[PDB]
Each structure stands twice: as structure tokens, then as C-alpha cells.
């Protein structure tokens, strides 16, 4: 896949209620509150069950257990793609590269980390 420009430090992110915040300052509650505020999107916990790094040049394959039922979902992303872990924030495969490329402090995504994902409601 590819990488969008909104993970870049200083990127203005508009929360559900209209409030503006820099992407580096986003917290778990900002997402939780935004899902509540929204009339169509809700938050779904996605737990990382396995990370199969170096699938191909610059890509990792992550296997999640999405939502209540825990449906096995595997996805393919550029190593520097950051997920937002509940109570932890931006987390990727290569924190170092995500930080260098995005100037975003970042954790090491790990088996067991519950990520924030979305589904219609």
C-alpha cells in the first residue's frame, strides 16, 4: 500500500465535535469521544494476534482479531504505518522509521496490542 500525509507532525485533525488538534496530540479519549459524537461511526477494538514482518520490500503483514466476535483479519501495510493503540497512541512495526519519516513519537506495535479501528453504526 502507501502512506497518507496526515500522520505528519503538525497535521490539523478535526475531531467529531469540530475541535481542531495536531495529530501528535491526539489521545485515546479524543477518538472515543469522536465515535460517540458521530452518528455513523463507532469504535471497534482490534487485537494484534501476529506480525509477519518483511513480507516484501517495505511491507509488513499484520493479523488482527477484529471486534466482539474476533474475526481474523490480515492486512498489508508499509512498515511505517501507525496504528493507534488504546491507552498508548501511535504504534508501528518500525517506530524508528515512523518517527524519522513522520516526526511522530511512536511505540513498537506488538502482539496483544488493542488497536482502534472503525465500523459503521
Amino acid at each position: 500500500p502507501t502512506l497518507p500525509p496526515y500522520f505528519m507532525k503538525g497535521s490539523m485533525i478535526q475531531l467529531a465535535n469540530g475541535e481542531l488538534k495536531k495529530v501528535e496530540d491526539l489521545k485515546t479519549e479524543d477518538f472515543i469521544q469522536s465515535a460517540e459524537m458521530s452518528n455513523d461511526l463507532k469504535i471497534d477494538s482490534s487485537t494484534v494476534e501476529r506480525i509477519e514482518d518483511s513480507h516484501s520490500p517495505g511491507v509488513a503483514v499484520i493479523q488482527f482479531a477484529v471486534g466482539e466476535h474476533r474475526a481474523q483479519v490480515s492486512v498489508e501495510v508499509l512498515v511505517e504505518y501507525p496504528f493507534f493503540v488504546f491507552g498508548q497512541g501511535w504504534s508501528s512495526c518500525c517506530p524508528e522509521r515512523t518517527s524519522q519519516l513522520f516526526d511522530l513519537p511512536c511505540s513498537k506495535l506488538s502482539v496483544g496490542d488493542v488497536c482502534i479501528s472503525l465500523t459503521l453504526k
Binding site: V23, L26, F84
Partner: peptide
């Protein structure tokens, strides 16, 4: 005045 802004729902995947 106006500025380019990204919505919060772009930062999180639809797994």
C-alpha cells in the same frame, strides 16, 4: 479565513 484539515476518521483503519 480557511485551512486544510483532515477528519479524525482518516487516521484509523476500517478493518
Amino acid at each position: 479565513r480557511s485551512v486544510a484539515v483532515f477528519p479524525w476518521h482518516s487516521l484509523v483503519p476500517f478493518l
